[PDB]
Amino acid sequence: SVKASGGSSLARPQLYQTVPVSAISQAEQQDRFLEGSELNELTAYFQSGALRLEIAETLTQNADLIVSRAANRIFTGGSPLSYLEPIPPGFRPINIARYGPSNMQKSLRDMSWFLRYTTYAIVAGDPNIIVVNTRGLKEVIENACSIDATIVAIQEMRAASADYFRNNAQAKEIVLQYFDILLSEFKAPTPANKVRQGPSNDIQGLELPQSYFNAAAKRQKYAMKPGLSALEKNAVIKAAYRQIFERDITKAYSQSISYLESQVRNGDISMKEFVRRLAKSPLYRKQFFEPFINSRALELAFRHILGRGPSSREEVQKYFSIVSSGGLPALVDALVDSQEYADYFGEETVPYLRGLGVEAQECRNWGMQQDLFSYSAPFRKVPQFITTFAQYDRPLPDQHVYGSGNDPLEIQFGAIFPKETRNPSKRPAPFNKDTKRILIHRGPAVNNQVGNPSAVGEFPGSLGAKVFRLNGGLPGAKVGKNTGTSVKFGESSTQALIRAAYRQVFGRDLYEGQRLSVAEIQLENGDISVREFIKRLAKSELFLKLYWAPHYVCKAIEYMHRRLLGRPTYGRQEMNQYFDIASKQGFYAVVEAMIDSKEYSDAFGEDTVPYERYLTPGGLQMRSARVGSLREDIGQRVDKEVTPRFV
Partner 1 sequence: MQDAITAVINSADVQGKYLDGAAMDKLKSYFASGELRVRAASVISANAATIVKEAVAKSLLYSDVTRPGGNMYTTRRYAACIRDLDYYLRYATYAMLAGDASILDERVLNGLKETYNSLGVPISSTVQAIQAIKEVTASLVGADAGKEMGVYLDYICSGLS
Partner 2 sequence: SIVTKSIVNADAEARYLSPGELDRIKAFVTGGAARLRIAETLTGSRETIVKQAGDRLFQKRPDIVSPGGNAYGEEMTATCLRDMDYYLRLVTYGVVSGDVTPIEEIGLVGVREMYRSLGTPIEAVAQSVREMKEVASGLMSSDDAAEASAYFDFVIGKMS
Partner 3 sequence: MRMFRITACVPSQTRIRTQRELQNTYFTKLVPYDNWFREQQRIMKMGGKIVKVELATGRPGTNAGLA
Residues at the interface with partner 2 (CB under 8 A):
17, 19, 22-23, 26, 35-38, 40-41, 43-45, 48, 125-128, 174, 177, 218, 220-222, 229-232, 234-235
Interface residue with partner 1 among 43, 47, 72, 177 (CB under 8 A) is 177
Segment near ligand CYC (CB under 6 A); pick from 93-101, 121-129, 181-189, 288-296: 288-296
Distance, first Cα to last Cα, the chain:
62
Per partner kind, with CB cut-offs from 5 to 8 A, the member of partner 1, partner 3, ligand CYC, none near residue 294 is ligand CYC
Strands 440-441 and 608-609: unpaired
Q: Which residues pair with 609 in a beta bridge?
A: 468
> By C-beta, is 180 or 491 nearer to partner 1?
180
| Beta-bridge partner residues of 469 | 608
Residue 265 Cβ, how far from partner 3 at the closest point, in Å? 14
Distances 214 to 15, 16, 136, 160 between C-alpha atoms, Å? 9, 8, 11, 29
3-class state of residue 509 by DSSP: coil
Q: Which does 125 bind (CB under 5 to 8 A by kind): partner 2, partner 1, partner 3, none?
A: partner 2
Q: What is the largest CA-CA distance in the chain?
A: 120
Count the site residues for ligand CYC by CB under 6 A: 25
Give the length of the chain: 647
181 closest CA partner among 154, 160, 161: 154
Nearer to partner 3, 63 or 360 (CB): 360
The nearer residue to partner 1, 135 or 364, going by C-beta atoms, is 135
Dist CA 108 CA 553 (whole Å): 52
Please count the other Cβ atoms lying within 10 Å of the Cβ belonging to residue 400: 22
Q: Is 180 in the site for partner 1 (CB under 8 A)?
A: yes
Query: Does 229 engage in binding with partner 1 (CB under 8 A)?
Result: yes
Q: Using the rule CB under 8 A, which residue among 53, 195, 445, 549 binds partner 3?
A: 195
**For residue 83, how many C-alpha atoms fall within 13 Å in the half-sphere facing its CB?**
11
Separation CA 304–CA 477 (nearest Å): 76
The C-alpha atoms of residue 363 and residue 382 are separated, in whole angstroms, by: 22
Residue 501 in contact with residue 537, Cβ under 8 Å?
yes
Gyration radius of the chain's alpha carbons: 36
* 121: exposed, middle or buried (Cβ count in 10 Å: 0-12, 13-18, 19+): buried
The Cα–Cα gap between 501 and 516 comes to 12
Residue 511-530 contact track with partner 1, rule CB under 8 A, x = bound:
--------------------
Q: Is 266 an interacting residue with respect to partner 1 (CB under 8 A)?
A: yes
Residue 606 · residue 471 · CB < 8 Å: no
Does position 147 interact with partner 1 (CB under 8 A)? The reply is no
44 vs 445, which CB is nearer to partner 2?
44
145 has binding-site annotation: yes
Least Å distance, CB 50 to partner 2, is 14
Based on the shown chain and the rule CB under 6 A, indicate whether residue 441 belongs to the binding site for ligand CYC: yes
Residues 249-278 that bind partner 3 (CB under 8 A): 263, 267-270, 272-273, 276
Give whichever of 254 and 629 is closer to partner 2, judged by the CB atom. 254
Say if residues 290 and 328 touch (Cβ distance below 8 Å).
Answer: no
Find out whether 275 and 331 touch, Cβ atoms under 8 Å: no
Residue 518 interacting entry, from partner 1, ligand CYC, partner 2, none, C-beta within 5 to 8 Å by type: none
**Among the candidate windows 76-84, 224-232, 330-338, 438-446, which touches partner 1 by CB under 8 A?**
224-232
Q: Does 115 bind ligand CYC (CB under 6 A)?
A: no
- Stretch of 279-287, 444-452, 476-484, 577-585 lying at the interface with ligand CYC (CB under 6 A): 444-452
With CB under 5 to 8 Å by kind, the binding choice for 222 among partner 1, partner 3, partner 2, none is partner 2
CA 299/CA 377 separation, integer angstroms: 10
Least distance (Å) from partner 2 to the CB of residue 134? Answer: 16
Nearest approach in angstroms of CB 572 to ligand CYC is 17
Does residue 263 touch ligand CYC according to CB under 6 A?
A: yes
Counting contacts by CB under 8 A, is residue 262 touching partner 1? yes
Distance of alpha carbon 94 from alpha carbon 243, whole angstroms: 56
- The amino acid at residue 186 is F
Least distance to partner 2, CB of residue 168, Å: 15
* Helix runs in 267-327, H state only: 271-279, 282-288, 294-305, 313-325
Question: What is 2-19 written as a DSSP string?
Answer: -S-----PPP---SS--H
The interface partner of residue 317, options being partner 1, ligand CYC, partner 2, none and the CB cut-off 5 to 8 Å by kind, is ligand CYC
> Residues 552, 556, 562, 565: is their CA dihedral positive or negative?
negative
Annotated binding residues for (2R,3E)-phycocyanobilin, as ranges?
Answer: 145
Residue ranges that bind ligand CYC, judged by CB under 6 A: 259, 262-263, 265-266, 293-295, 317, 320, 386, 390, 411-414, 416, 438, 440-441, 445, 448, 450, 507-508
Residue ranges that bind partner 3, judged by CB under 8 A: 192, 194-197, 210, 213, 221, 223, 225, 263, 267-270, 272-273, 276, 333, 337, 339, 342-349
